[PDB]
Amino acid sequence: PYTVVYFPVRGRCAALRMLLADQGQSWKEEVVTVETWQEGSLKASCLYGQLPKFQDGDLTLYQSNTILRHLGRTLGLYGKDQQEAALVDMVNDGVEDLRCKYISLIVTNYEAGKDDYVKALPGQLKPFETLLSQNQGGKTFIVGDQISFADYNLLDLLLIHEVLAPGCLDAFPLLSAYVGRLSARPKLKAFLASPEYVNLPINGNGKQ
């Protein structure tokens, strides 16, 4: 019933894939080549002219965070009540903002901008350390005591930043422990080690 339509990349599909794997859900991957993409007709049929496209039976979705929220809702990964749901959105929106900066660097300014970016990174990572510290000493999840879609998205942003700036989480013991703890969940651990995850590059220009 689920189909992910994307480039041969981790990118904006890494978090939703981790979620689906961790939750024991099956899905199909439909891969779009650069050639298919540049021919232009699939792009023309995309709502906002972008991928991922996601299919849930006859429901067609665009926008990676829409997909995340949809699976959160359907799979019960959206907090225990309405106040937790708001906190879950607040984290995800914050994650989305640092991801936009991360993509901008990768695409438009990797070589010249990297140095500056890695320097501003501690200040960008701190709110998430704070959020953990205020949630049972950072011992469980980013919101409440059950996993949410924001957890998968944050885990991913943190994995890719440790690739970009190895040791960037040394400054943040709760975020460091959170990564190890979430990465060690049985289904997720198995998925993160698999060729289907491992043999995809993070980004499409090979920069990371």
| Tokens describing residue 172 | 């943040």
- Residue 89 or 188 with smaller CB distance to a second copy: 89
- Sheet hosting strand 53-56, strand order edge to edge: 28-31, 2-6, 53-56, 59-62
Q: Which residue has the tokens 């049972």?
A: 136
What's the min distance (Å) between Cβ of 87 and a second copy? 8
What's the min distance (Å) between Cβ of 13 and a second copy? 15
What's the min distance (Å) between Cβ of 101 and Cl ion? 11
Do 160 and 102 meet the contact criterion of CB atoms below 8 Å apart?
yes
| Tokens describing residue 101 | 């900066």
| Tokens describing residue 200 | 């995809």
DSSP string spanning 19-54? Answer: HHHHTT---EEEE--HHHHHH-HHHHHSTTS-S-EE
Residue 146 touches which member of Cl ion, a second copy, Ca ion, none, C-beta under 5-8 Å by kind? Ca ion
157 labelled ligand-binding: no
Contact positions vs a second copy (CB under 8 A): 47-48, 59, 61-63, 65-66, 69-70, 73-74, 82-83, 85-86, 89-90, 93-94, 97, 127, 130-131
- Residue 85 or 174 with smaller CB distance to Cl ion: 85
Residue 76 touches which member of Cl ion, a second copy, Ca ion, none, C-beta under 5-8 Å by kind? Ca ion
Count residues contacting Cl ion (CB under 5 A)?
1
| Residue 59-98 contact track with Ca ion, rule CB under 5 A, x = bound | -----------------x----------------------
**97 touches Cl ion (CB under 5 A):** yes
Do 62 and 50 meet the contact criterion of CB atoms below 8 Å apart?
yes
63 labelled ligand-binding: yes
**Residue 40 backbone zone (phi > 0: left; psi -120 to 50: alpha; other: beta):** left
CA angle 35, 113, 119 (to 5 degrees): 130
Do 149 and 68 meet the contact criterion of CB atoms below 8 Å apart?
yes
Estimate the crossing angle of helix 149-164 against helix 173-183, to 10 degrees. Answer: 110
Cβ-closest position to Cl ion: 97
Question: What residue numbers does the annotated binding site for glutathione cover?
Answer: 6, 12, 37, 43, 50-51, 63-64
Binding site for Cl ion (CB under 5 A): 97
Binding site for Ca ion (CB under 5 A): 76, 146
